[PDB]
Write a protein that binds this ligand. Structure first.
Ligand SMILES: NC(=O)C1=CN([C@@H]2O[C@H](COP(=O)(O)OP(=O)(O)OC[C@H]3O[C@@H](n4cnc5c(N)ncnc54)[C@H](O)[C@@H]3O)[C@@H](O)[C@H]2O)C=CC1
Ligand SMILES: NC(=O)C1=CN([C@@H]2O[C@H](COP(=O)(O)OP(=O)(O)OC[C@H]3O[C@@H](n4cnc5c(N)ncnc54)[C@H](O)[C@@H]3O)[C@@H](O)[C@H]2O)C=CC1
Ligand SMILES: NC(=O)C1=CN([C@@H]2O[C@H](COP(=O)(O)OP(=O)(O)OC[C@H]3O[C@@H](n4cnc5c(N)ncnc54)[C@H](O)[C@@H]3O)[C@@H](O)[C@H]2O)C=CC1
Ligand SMILES: NC(=O)C1=CN([C@@H]2O[C@H](COP(=O)(O)OP(=O)(O)OC[C@H]3O[C@@H](n4cnc5c(N)ncnc54)[C@H](O)[C@@H]3O)[C@@H](O)[C@H]2O)C=CC1
Ligand SMILES: NC(=O)C1=CN([C@@H]2O[C@H](COP(=O)(O)OP(=O)(O)OC[C@H]3O[C@@H](n4cnc5c(N)ncnc54)[C@H](O)[C@@H]3O)[C@@H](O)[C@H]2O)C=CC1
Lengths: 279, 275, 281, 277, 275
């Protein structure tokens, strides 16, 4: 991997996503823990000290991170992005590749901020999720106006080391946020509820969590490796008159499917609001 | 070691495919039997190298480990057909939902005393070697019988021994669970399509998100609520979506499901035990 | 062993919050009641009657409070605040710290009014709740433009004597209002209902109120003193197949969680919406 | 509580919670407690171990050690336990059953086949004894001495509120204060979600919501006033609180908490009507 | 007669398959074009005999009847690309949902006056020659243009002329309608499976019942309520099931669907017309 030979990486914002990618990247063995830098105005958080246990260099000053970094991740709340771009924008050299992870924030807003300091800022927008921490992430990215082709290919190689990754048009990223960005939280809620179900029927809680998580993992893997439609796989499991089809009825009766549609839609719609509450 | 399957449908194919993929069993040392020797699962096992037959008696004579993978109401008819063919060497592994070790031991004890019986509940993801399997050892299962089953089935997913009275609840949880996930994924994909994603991409991303979250939980020392907290940034998109799931009673629906599947499982065995 | 010997406290407004804070400050020992003065236009209030028993000095004239006080709590309704500021703005001195407890009212609107009379007024915005009265309040505060560093430390010192207190950014305070400011009323509603349930299943009302409140108190204390997620503590009570997991299910079937999220949201939105119509007017 | 020896049959969540509370209170030396379980691998067993509690796989050893013996196993284990160690219950023992649903009557039936006057007490407590803010009730059996009830009240009062009740109230208490902490933890998790939705950091929103519930409960305990009156004092006309109370009312918030207490009480009586038959 | 398709996806395959099955068009006289000349619909048309190309201009030059079967937001880009290639001989048939005759005529009138434009709304069952199709003739459509389109499309299903302002409502009804039916059938099949039927049999019987009822209504002079009456015997099984549909507001859900699809169709065209 000549891409990652001597590449440095930095994070502005040292929160949940910064730790997850740093944990993912280092576990994948694509980068050394000391070759990554993160910043936060609060070195007192949990994420900050976990990153330090990793051996990640931590500083309070975002201008330190930009100086040390080839690829620069922006891992801060959406409304901070233009505040950060004012602060470090005169420090963005032509060598930098600025990868924005903030939900909603458009390539255009970032480029307008940085194109006032140097004409051709190299910007990539990305939407990832926390399972990169076990190298099973789901990632999309869109390339900006001045991103060279090697920048898209480096980004793919880097983010494929921690999970699935593909390029998309930027107009899809809000919807991806609602689906795979927020998706893991839908899954954690589901697994907690399924374990409550297991407990209600007599199972020890530890066992019920394990069995629920394994069933969801196995089922998602089955879908990824099958050519068959989701409903065909459901049919394979649903014996006539059986326990499973009886359970599927009660899911249907509460509008189970519509709740997951509602969830993707509400996250996507909130992601658009977060962007226009910047423009 | 020689393994047999009575019933050559969905579950037989999943386990045999997983065993052979795992490298713990060679397809030629596996024999499976079914009457309608024309079903699609039959052909899938035949293109796989499994030995096939319409005679349940030939499967018994060929195997040391004998899986029962027929619909639960068929188990008694099978135990009658082959009960006289069971030898000392056999381990009988019932995969049937609801069917008790007691009921199997009572039908097979009329032919030879001390049948070695194991009850398991598994699920279809054994096909990709990510199944969830529990098992209970029967009255006459020796020590090496439970250790062998756990070794064999650990090769196609998670596997642990349980007291038999947990198994109907496991059935509602990890037995039916993949169908809950398949439903969830079809719906998440519809959500992704509603918001502008192509179906193909939406299916892939939804499935990858469920898999990754599941792997995270399994590999973490943390409560699923705590992992939920990390994803849901303050004022953010995730916590907005979580609210609409809560407003629908999302959690209660999953509790309802596990319960309904467990209760149906007991109900079915009750009708079996009534006769 | 805290005590502010050179500090005189005043309250403009002598209703629920002022009584709650005066009662808590005095029970904490940090403030003798006679070093506290409160003012209200209705000297025949139950709260004014209560404050009089504690020894607090009472007056109808707000200027009197301002002239006596160093730390000046604005404890009137949000829409009264601009009239209060117009009346006593010319009486604010350098020595004053103005602590606004009004829901929604920004530091900016207070500072703009008072800056017309004397530049650089020292303003602190505060969100607290009634349990300060038993010294278990939840308080956040934000420091204004001209508040010294010792002003915030002093206010955190003082408000810490009656419960939890921390500094926050001002743009979090409307959300705190939705959670801990309105939070006691959610709890009172919950305890009335749980007691109703205890009565339905055959408990005497008095016992059912006691047990319910003790259960909420103990659980909240457990969470405050644990490093564990609330779901984990919940799991320790929910024995497999037991009574508790059966009750959790019916709570889940009603959307219990979403109602509490709805409540926090509704209180915060209303807090923003009151302020925004004050700003226009 | 001079030199009392305490035992728990069952080394699970409640056994840990009470042992933690009693040693926190300083009423018991950890090493004067003995707990038994057939699975010495559990996390509760490791925590008890680190506390200094004596652990053993043999229930008979717990019994011989104890003066006060707590039964802290699942309700349906209780008859298996009494069969097993029933011949080892001595006249000096006070047997305290913590199991939801199990009646004094059913315990005395099993035990009096061995000695004629087993001293039995039934209680319902909850996990906040761990921070000495438990809510505990107890009822005295046929042969419990007057001193036995006073001893038990003194012991349980050191880790929270404790009062004697008639036994016919204990299933209802189970639904209220026994299961109550779980309802509170659910409430707190949801209040924090709401705080996060409106823009608070998770840690701060957990802290403030917990502080709010604790302070409100304490207010009501120290007030001679109806909880509706206290609610009135919080909600200013046209204000934020009264808007939030409305959306709670529109979802039937009150009725859900009533359904909860009722469902847990009814389940508790089912956990006994199954054992009895 | 030579027919062309710009866009070679779901709808192009359905219509071409139906036309050739019908015998009104030979596959070799049909040309279709797409950029991603790799999609599965592309291969299905290639195994069919349709002529294929990545150049939209070649489709125009080859056809007399030119169908537009691209996603609605692509229509303007296409009208720009080929507007200069349109000749007097062409009939332009837009299949795009929402897209108005006005908007197409305005883009093509900038190159040659009086373009012959037809707007239709069709659906996927044209693939089995049972589609539902309406059409509106444009400003410069001669008389033989509307009669030709009706002849061509009557061969793959029902076809009638409508005023253009009904077409967005038709889209919510018969355009999206097959998806409502597919959903209904998956669910009826689940119902059949819950009550003991094998999935395969349940799918077949459900689909046959919907088809037969639909044919009955189309071939009867009677109100659908009256046909409902004949099936529901007094005290019987049908009227019990109808009650549970009514208690769920079954009818209102279908009204909601048609409305939601119609409204989304107008909304989308509004965003198009805004720019
Ligand atoms: N948490 C998740 O699962 C995902 C989050 N994201 C995005 O990542 C960004 C952060 O997500 P989280 O890490 O969850 O937020 P987080 O708040 O845990 O981390 C954000 C960090 O930024 C720090 N920060 C605040 N002001 C700063 C400043 N002026 N300069 C530098 N650092 C500053 C804060 O101290 C905080 O720790 C958001 O934009 C979110 O949309 C994207 C994908 C998934
Ligand atoms: N499909 C699933 O998701 C799971 C299934 N199981 C259990 O495994 C068993 C079957 O599961 P599936 O394979 O899904 O059912 P299936 O219907 O695919 O397999 C049934 C097989 O039994 C065969 N059969 C019928 N009568 C027979 C006889 N007299 N002798 C021999 N074979 C006979 C049929 O020909 C068919 O091949 C059931 O007891 C079910 O509870 C366990 C857990 C999950
Ligand atoms: N009660 C609560 O739970 C909390 C109250 N607050 C805030 O504190 C303020 C008041 O709280 P409450 O005491 O509940 O209101 P309250 O209505 O109980 O007392 C209000 C006081 O304002 C007095 N007042 C009216 N006009 C006045 C004037 N021109 N000059 C002086 N006093 C005047 C009234 O006579 C009364 O004594 C409000 O802004 C409220 O948002 C904040 C947190 C919690
Ligand atoms: N956890 C709670 O919040 C409360 C529980 N209780 C009651 O306390 C009892 C247990 O509560 P948890 O500790 O939650 O159960 P738990 O399941 O956490 O612990 C149960 C203990 O019993 C042990 N055990 C199993 N068989 C045994 C045997 N034959 N001999 C000795 N020990 C054996 C288990 O290994 C485990 O250590 C139940 O009856 C429950 O109703 C009462 C009030 C509150
Ligand atoms: N699928 C259905 O049920 C019905 C579809 N329609 C309409 O027909 C049109 C397409 O329907 P589908 O075929 O389902 O969409 P589809 O996505 O299957 O076909 C779209 C085709 O457009 C092609 N395309 C994209 N850009 C192009 C360009 N610049 N030049 C040429 N071809 C290009 C794509 O490669 C793809 O083959 C839409 O306007 C839709 O409203 C009408 C009624 C029902």
């Amino acid at each position: 991997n000549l891409y990652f030979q001597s590449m440095s990486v930095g994070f502005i914002g040292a929160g949940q996503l910064a730790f997850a990618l740093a944990k993912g990247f280092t576990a994948a063995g694509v980068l050394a823990a000391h070759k990554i830098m993160a910043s936060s105005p609060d070195m007192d958080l949990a994420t900050v000290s976990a990153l330090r246990k990793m051996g990640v260099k931590l500083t309070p000053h975002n201008k330190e991170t930009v100086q040390h970094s080839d690829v620069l991740f922006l891992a801060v709340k959406p409304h901070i992005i233009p505040f950060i771009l004012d602060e470090i924008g005169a420090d963005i050299e032509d060598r930098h590749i600025v990868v924005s992870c903030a939900a909603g924030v458009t390539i255009s807003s970032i480029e307008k901020k940085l194109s006032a300091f140097r004409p051709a800022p190299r910007v990539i927008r990305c939407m990832t999720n926390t399972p990169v921490v076990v190298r099973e992430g789901a990632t999309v990215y869109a390339t900006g106006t001045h991103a060279q082709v090697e920048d898209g290919r480096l980004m793919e190689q880097l983010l494929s080391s921690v999970g699935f990754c593909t390029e998309v048009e930027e107009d899809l990223i809000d919807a991806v946020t609602g689906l795979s960005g927020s998706g893991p939280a839908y899954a954690f809620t589901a697994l907690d509820a399924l374990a409550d179900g297991g407990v209600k029927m007599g199972l020890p809680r530890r066992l019920a969590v394990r069995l629920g998580a394994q069933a969801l993992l196995g089922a998602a893997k089955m879908l990824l490796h099958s050519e068959q439609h989701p409903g065909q796989l459901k049919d394979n499991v649903s014996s006539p008159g059986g326990a499973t089809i009886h359970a599927l009825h009660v899911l249907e009766s509460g509008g189970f499917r519509s709740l997951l549609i509602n969830a993707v839609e509400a996250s996507c719609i909130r992601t658009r609001e977060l962007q226009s509450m910047a423009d």
